[PDB]
Amino acid sequence: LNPGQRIIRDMEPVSHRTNRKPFTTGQAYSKIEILNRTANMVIDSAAECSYTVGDKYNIVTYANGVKTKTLDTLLNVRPNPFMDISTFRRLVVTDLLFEGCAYIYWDGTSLYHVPAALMQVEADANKFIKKFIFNNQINYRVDEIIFIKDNSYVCGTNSQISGQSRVATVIDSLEKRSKMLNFKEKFLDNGTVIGLILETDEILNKKLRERKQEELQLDYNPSTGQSSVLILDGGMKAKPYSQISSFKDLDFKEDIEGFNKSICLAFGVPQVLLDGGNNANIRPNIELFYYMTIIPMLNKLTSSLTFFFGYKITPNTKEVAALTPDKEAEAKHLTSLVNNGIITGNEARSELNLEPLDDEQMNKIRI
Amino acid sequence: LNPGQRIIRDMEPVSHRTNRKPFTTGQAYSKIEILNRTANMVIDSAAECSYTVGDKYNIVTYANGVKTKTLDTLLNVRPNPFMDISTFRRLVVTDLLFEGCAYIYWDGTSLYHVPAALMQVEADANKFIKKFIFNNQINYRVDEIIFIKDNSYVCGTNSQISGQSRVATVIDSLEKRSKMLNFKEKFLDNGT
Amino acid sequence: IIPMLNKLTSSLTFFFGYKITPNTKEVAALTPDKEAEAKHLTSLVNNGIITGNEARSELNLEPLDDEQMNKIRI
Amino acid sequence: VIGLILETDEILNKKLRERKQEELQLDYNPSTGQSSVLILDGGMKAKPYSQISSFKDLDFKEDIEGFNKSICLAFGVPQVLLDGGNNANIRPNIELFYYMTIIPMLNKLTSSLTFFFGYKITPNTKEVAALTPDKEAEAKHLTSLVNNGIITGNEARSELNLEPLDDEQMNKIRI
Amino acid sequence: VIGLILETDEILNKKLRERKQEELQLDYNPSTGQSSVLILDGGMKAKPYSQISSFKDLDFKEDIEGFNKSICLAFGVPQVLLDGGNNANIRPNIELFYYMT
């Protein structure tokens, strides 16, 4: 064992919540459209991916006696008797995204999801971790929980526990943008416009003064009125006024655009996916997004599951519609490989997502 | 079973409606061109897609005894004896889009649509969910309803129930734009 | 669209126990290019990976009850 | 922000002065109000004021952009990965990032491990999704090398991340 | 930064003067306030001031870019490697850097 695990325990006995503002998070998610779209895109893309259970690693694991078919059914078909696979995956992904850590409880035969807003992980003096405390009371144990953690740098030292959430980082930019937008709308609402100003040095009959104010305003409007010439008699003048505060000084386009780009950068969604563009803009950006953003996020979970069960579990899409390969190039390279002898026909059929055919010459290499 | 389902029930016993402004939603849908076009495009595109029933998974399900052909006819040809497949799909999709969740009641031999604006989902202390309350009265049960939920982050905790509607995010920018347009037209009208 | 329908199909699969997946294959806006489809289908059929009946099914035609269309040519 | 400034040389009834201030502000707003013409009687004037400090002098876009450029440079991530771009740009930048930034960093660790244990340890991705090679070019060069005789079939299968097949003619060079 | 300058030729009660300074500043901000019109009584005027030193005269982009380019030139790293570009920019620049430097 590690001789200095006690020191690391004393440095940070328990986990710390890293989602400092949950209510503001919920309000921004509920009333800001960029946040809603990006978060929904990330969660749906992560939940779309499937899982594959392969070889068995000869190591001692927390959960033993579990067959490959049971894992295949749990991860793919239906984890709980009472909950969907899509709902389970989306809940786990949103827990991981909004909160630094995510947890999945392991029952005798099924995987139950546990919210991460109430979990508090307690470190151990000797090995790694002593116990998990769901809010309070229950005190799960350790053998029954799968632990997924994002890399975090809290306070001074990096933590073996806890985890830092991507959505908190974005919370300031939305506030900064919303303040400016509300400022613009309130400036428009409270502004005043004046068309004509007349000045006199005498007290001219307030009532008929207001009557003349109405009369001139109606008459000189070119939409409803047919007057253009004004004759001022009695000494009345016209002050050549100007506009003090105009709406052209408020140039908020660049700042709002920068805040939007910063939000998209923080979540990791490429700009082209949100806007749309040419084919060369479309497909490589989809591949970049899916692979380089989602696949590490699922890789954390798959590594945790591999540690827990002892079976090689890797993310495998191979069905996602947005990752559908080009038909012509796929056919060309598969047929070339099959004809030249590198791969059998059955392997090509499997890669085409078809079913292997029980022939004789398709299980032997042609040349 | 989960040893801590009681705590999750205590946190969120019942569902919460996330369509805060329904009347403003309806008025904007009725009198805004971009909202109408985008919503119609999404709903029609979702309703265009068909469904395929394939292999049978050897698990114990809520509804058993249904053959492949009957399910295929229900999903594709004609769900109810009294309503269209296109109308059924469009209703389900618009319920899912405007309200966070959508529901489909399961009768003896056919699928009946139930609006999501009135149903309230009651969580269970032990397993997942106790009953669905259609406004009031009925208390359907659970075995008779298909539940579809969008991912939601309400208040502080993400709920296993409820769901967050995409159209409400818009009911802010639409008002901001309409105010500016009306300001422009009235400034033009009142000028001299 | 497809994730939106995927939630519904996953719920239906849980409810009924039948693998239900979204499948367009008929949507006019998703009509594939005729020439590229013909090229890749004919290459796959001739080289031996895919039988003729599978190609007809992917062309949204009906299977034809022949003898040499249910066996791999080469 | 100020819309209108009126000045007078006499003390005109503070309370009704404020009432007139709110009345004019409500009336002359084109959003809620239908007045455009104003008459000043009794000697009240209007000072043609201007704006001292505007929001157009605060041009901060370039400096903030430069700070972002410097941060991205300091860590080493090509900017196209963060922003996104065309077909040609999107793959070479991924390769440049991974190789130049990551691989030396893992190379330090692998050299230390080789010193510690005495086994040649080298970083090997060959599985990273973002480094997935082009299918057509890979097939072309592998098939050419296999057919011409430089590389056996088993080596090609291994490079394709498949499993070696226990045949006879795949462990001997064809020509 | 200054928004309004009002001038008077009399000693008008410093304390209430500061109170009015706070009141006008809070009232006339469109973020928190619903007033747009001001009336000056008693002889108080408004000086049309301007801005002496602005932030637009400080154009430092070109000089900083020149210094960064000079540093990169001194070490020998091509600018494209630091910024990133197209494939024809990526590979030849990598080869040039490695070889020549």
Residue numbers in the entry:
A (entry chain E): 11 to 377
B (entry chain D): 11 to 202
C (entry chain D): 304 to 377
D (entry chain F): 203 to 377
E (entry chain G): 203 to 303
Sentences from the paper on this structure:
Bacteriophage T5, a representative member of the T5-like family of siphophages, serves as an excellent model for studying the assembly, infection, cell wall perforation, and DNA ejection mechanisms of this phage family. In this study, we used cryo-electron microscopy (cryo-EM) to determine the structures of mature T5 (a laboratory-adapted, fiberless T5 mutant) and urea-treated empty T5 (lacking the tip complex) at near-atomic resolutions. The T5 tail, which comprises 40 trimeric rings of the TTP and a distal tip complex, is connected to a unique five-fold vertex of the head by the connector complex.
Using the local reconstruction method, we then obtained the structures of the connector complex and the portal of mature T5 at resolutions of 4.8 and 3.2 Å, respectively. The T5 portal consists of 12 copies of pb7, which replaces a penton at a unique vertex of the head and provides an entry and exit channel for DNA packaging and ejection. Based on our density map, we built an atomic model of pb7 from residues 11 to 377 of the total 403 residues. According to the domain nomenclature of the portal protein, each pb7 monomer can be divided into four domains: a crown domain (residues 337–377), a wing domain (residues 11–175, and 278–336), a stem domain (residues 176–200, and 263–277), and a clip domain (residues 201–262). Imposing C12 symmetry on the portal by means of local reconstruction revealed that the wing domain’s positively charged residue, lys77, was anchored to the DNA fragment, clearly indicating the major and minor grooves of the double-stranded DNA. Each p144 monomer contains an attachment domain (residues 46–110) and a helix bundle domain (residues 1–45 and 111–170). The attachment domain is anchored to the outer surface of the portal, whereas the helix bundle domain is attached to the top of the tail terminator.
